[PDB]
Design a protein around this ligand. Structure first.
Ligand SMILES: *[C@@H]1O[C@H](CO)[C@@H](O[C@@H]2O[C@H](CO)[C@@H](O)[C@H](O)[C@H]2NC(C)=O)[C@H](O)[C@H]1NC(C)=O
Ligand SMILES: *[C@@H]1O[C@H](CO)[C@@H](O)[C@H](O)[C@H]1NC(C)=O
Ligand SMILES: *[C@@H]1O[C@H](CO)[C@@H](O)[C@H](O)[C@H]1NC(C)=O
Ligand SMILES: *[C@@H]1O[C@H](CO)[C@@H](O)[C@H](O)[C@H]1NC(C)=O
Lengths: 315, 148, 188, 126
């Protein structure tokens, strides 16, 4: 049916319009050369990338942290030595030291140890400068623009069963298309999950993505890229560039035995190899679309600290 | 049945390792336990300023070697893996007979009948497809700039 | 106020001045009129050389790279490894694998001339049609996919730059302060 | 594009973390008083010291000093992160709020929002 019903049944010569390339269409007729790198991809709703990590110690202070504790214990042992030289700094120097690191209104004592006062002053200047550097490094971690993905594969763990995940997702295509034949050539279970989530059209699925009545949509790569470059608010952005896909292209299917085919293929080579196809891509694409609280993980570390304090509390 | 396969030393695709003891290949593994399927190829050290003449059978492996293994798994044929003489693709450079530009390299060895199939990710352009037929492009890859 | 200015200034040093230091726009004519420090080369007898010779504006780049023809691309790898080069036109994913190897070799974002790589073939042959069918059979399944998962997908701005000399200088100041403490205890 | 100037202090910002800190320091006071009753004007003083830890400007804490030092370090790193992301919110708040030249693909298919026009019978229109 369609252009295949018009060309293979010889009611039409060729389809100069764009056409997907797969197995059986290459079996019935011969395509042209792939003039554009157009695989398949999945348009998603939104990555919801917020710049906040769950952890704040190990991605920031890993190699610094050991030397900081080593110098902390050295300064505390020196303070113990000064307190034993010449009224609670026998073993309680560490709480005093790391309370004077932050200076959060911690009344400790009036230091008469001059060596203790000098070491506290040097360590306090040091505490000011690494606190300043850590604020600067939090700024530097904010400087890059990253986005956290959720589906990073065609064999994703969500794709087994959405009963495992607390939000149920959704994905569908249009009927009577080569995309469904490609999915059925990949997974029958994927067609079993997709048949219940069928929809009507491309722009109808686009409006469903705009209103939030759709999560995922399997389609070609560059057409979704062109629709994402004209997206309002820059939200409907695909993940990747067809890296986890079959990575097909577009061709011109002629009748098997057409004498025009070699001239068409050499003309496509000439159109690509001079920037004229690049001029057409500049004329018909767009690439201006470039690239707040994720807390409570350190609250889990706080609960672990509460558990360890309850362990040390009983004895 | 006899398919003289020629290749150039591609750095991610054609890894050329010398043999271990006598014409043999080490059964090395990948990062997931899959053993590396090498093949017996015939390669020199360098070009003519590098080595005078020292061409030995070594072990060629990488990507296109396993691709040809997949081909021989698919279709019923045998093959013969060897290397290219020069280190060039092969363009239409002049021959010393009154400035007549001809082909050389992989194309010059293929059109001479010495080669049979060039399994190499060559940039498909106009004039090389004007003279011989190509295959469908397995790789979809562009061009870019490498900096420091 | 002084140390708050110091903290905000240390925040201000790492603010992204110099976002990119070269002329990586391919249509920028600074490469059309280069200098001595713009060492850009090509492999001798390459298809990219034919692609440049095919057009009419690639004259100066051709005249520069014909003085810089390389036998292999590994020569270019060794030259930019020894910082003899400054730019090189090459395929994307190979340089991606090299960036996975060594992080100093960094690509640019402008993807130009999206090309296709196939297999060098003869003319009309019975070992061309089934070959193309086997290529398409490799396309329809995840064979190039998991062969990219083997090594192509497989790769191989913190508190760490501003700590080492800080640690050494602070430890030296601590040892010198302890020595002065020995001197002041010896005074009393 | 001229947008007038609260900078998201508490009312535009999400108001969960202040209640979280209040309930957290409540749990802190509960476990401090369980430490007080099961000790291996004291109550109001321990409450005011629990406020004074957060005040950023001491009773018998033989094992409670670990609790105090963890809470104080957590409080200062949280307010330092809040300083960092408030400055991040007010500095990098420059979106694309224009057309960016005549070669805008987004105005090739406009809508009833980007309302652009010209003078009637102008040479620019020609
Ligand atoms: C490169 O070619 C040279 C020259 O043929 C090879 O050098 C020979 O190596 C063997 C084994 O060490 C020696 O016994 C010969 O005396 C060498 N010949 C000369 C003239 O140097 C060399 O093996 C080749 N490179 C490799 C490692 O394949
Ligand atoms: C391959 O070809 C040979 C030719 O004799 C034939 O006998 C054999 O059955 C074939 N085997 C396979 C693996 O197709
Ligand atoms: C071969 O071509 C070269 C090009 O310089 C020229 O010297 C001559 O015409 C030919 N033969 C010799 C003598 O090199
Ligand atoms: C293709 O398929 C089979 C097996 O490769 C072979 O026997 C046949 O002659 C081939 N014919 C074509 C169309 O090349």
């Amino acid at each position: 049916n369609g252009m295949i019903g018009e060309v293979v049944y010889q009611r039409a010569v060729m389809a100069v319009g764009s056409l997907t390339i797969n197995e059986e269409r290459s079996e019935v007729v011969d395509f042209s050369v792939p003039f554009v790198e157009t695989g398949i991809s999945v348009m998603v709703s939104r990555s919801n990338g917020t710049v906040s990590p769950s952890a704040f110690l190990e991605p920031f202070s890993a190699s610094v942290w050991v030397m900081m504790f080593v110098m902390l214990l050295i300064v505390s042992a020196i303070a113990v030595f000064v307190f034993e030289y010449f009224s609670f700094t026998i073993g309680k120097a560490i709480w005093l030291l790391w309370g004077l690191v932050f200076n959060n209104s911690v009344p400790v004592q009036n230091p008469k140890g001059t060596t203790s006062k000098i070491m506290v002053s040097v360590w306090a200047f040091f505490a000011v400068i690494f606190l300043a550097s850590y604020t600067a490094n939090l700024a530097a971690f904010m400087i890059q623009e990253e986005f956290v993905d959720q589906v990073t594969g065609l064999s994703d763990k969500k794709f087994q069963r959405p009963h495992d995940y607390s939000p149920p997702f959704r994905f569908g295509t249009v009927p009577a298309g080569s995309t469904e034949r490609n999915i059925r050539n990949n997974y029958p279970y994927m067609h079993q999950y997709m048949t219940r989530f069928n929809q009507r059209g491309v722009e109808d699925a686009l409006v469903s993505l705009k209103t939030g009545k759709l999560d995922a949509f399997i389609y070609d790569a560059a057409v979704l890229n062109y629709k994402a470059g004209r997206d309002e608010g820059c939200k409907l952005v695909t993940i990747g560039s067809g890296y986890i896909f079959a990575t097909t292209g577009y061709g011109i299917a002629l009748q098997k035995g057409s004498p025009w085919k070699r001239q068409i293929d050499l003309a496509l080579l000439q159109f690509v190899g001079d920037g004229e196809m690049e001029e057409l891509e500049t004329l018909w694409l767009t690439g201006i679309c470039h690239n707040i609280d994720n807390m409570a993980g350190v609250f889990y570390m706080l609960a672990a600290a509460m558990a360890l304090s309850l362990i040390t509390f009983i004895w | 049945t006899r398919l003289k396969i020629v290749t150039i030393h591609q750095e991610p695709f054609v890894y050329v390792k010398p043999t271990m003891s006598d014409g043999t290949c080490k059964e090395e593994f990948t990062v997931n336990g899959d053993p590396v399927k090498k093949v017996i190829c015939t390669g020199p050290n360098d070009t003519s300023p590098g080595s005078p003449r020292h061409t030995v059978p070594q072990c060629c492996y990488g990507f296109c070697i396993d691709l040809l293994i997949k081909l021989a798994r698919t279709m019923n044929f045998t093959y013969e893996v060897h290397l290219v003489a020069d280190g060039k693709f092969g363009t239409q450079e002049r021959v010393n007979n009154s400035n007549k530009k001809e082909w050389n390299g992989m194309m010059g060895e293929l059109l001479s009948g010495q080669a049979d199939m060039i399994v190499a990710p060559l940039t498909i352009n106009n004039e090389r497809a004007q003279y011989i037929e190509f295959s469908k492009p397995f790789k979809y890859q562009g061009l870019t700039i490498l900096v420091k | 106020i002084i140390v708050a200015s110091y903290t905000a200034n240390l925040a201000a040093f790492l603010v992204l001045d110099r976002p990119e230091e070269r002329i990586t726009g391919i249509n920028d004519p600074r490469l059309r009129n280069p200098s001595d420090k713009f060492i850009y080369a090509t492999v001798k007898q390459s298809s990219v050389d034919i692609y440049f010779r095919r057009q009419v504006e690639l004259s100066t780049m051709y005249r520069h790279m014909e003085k810089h023809n390389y036998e292999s691309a590994a020569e270019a790898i060794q030259a930019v490894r020894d910082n003899k080069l400054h730019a090189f036109i090459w395929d994307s994913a190979v340089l991606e694998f090299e960036a996975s190897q060594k992080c100093d070799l960094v690509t640019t974002g402008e993807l130009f001339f999206r090309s296709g790589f196939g297999i060098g073939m003869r003319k009309d042959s019975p070992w061309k049609q089934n070959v193309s069918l086997s290529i398409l059979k490799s396309h329809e399944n995840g064979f190039m996919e998991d062969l990219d998962k083997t090594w192509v997908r497989y790769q191989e701005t913190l508190t760490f730059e501003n700590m080492a000399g800080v640690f050494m200088l602070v430890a030296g100041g601590i040892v010198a302060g302890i020595f002065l403490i020995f001197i002041e205890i010896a005074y009393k | 594009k001229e947008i007038p100037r609260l900078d998201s202090f508490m009312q535009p910002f999400q108001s969960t973390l202040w209640l979280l800190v209040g309930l957290s320091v409540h749990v802190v006071a509960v476990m401090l008083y369980l430490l007080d009753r099961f000790s291996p004007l004291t109550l109001s003083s321990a409450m005011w010291f629990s406020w004074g830890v957060l005040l950023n400007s001491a009773p018998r804490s033989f094992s409670a000093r670990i609790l105090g030092m963890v809470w104080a370090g957590f409080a200062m790193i949280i307010v330092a992160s809040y300083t960092a992301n408030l400055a991040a919110f007010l500095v990098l708040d420059r979106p694309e709020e224009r057309i960016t030249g005549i070669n805008d693909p987004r105005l090739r298919n406009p809508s009833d929002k980007f309302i652009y026009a010209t003078v009637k019978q102008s040479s620019v229109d020609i």
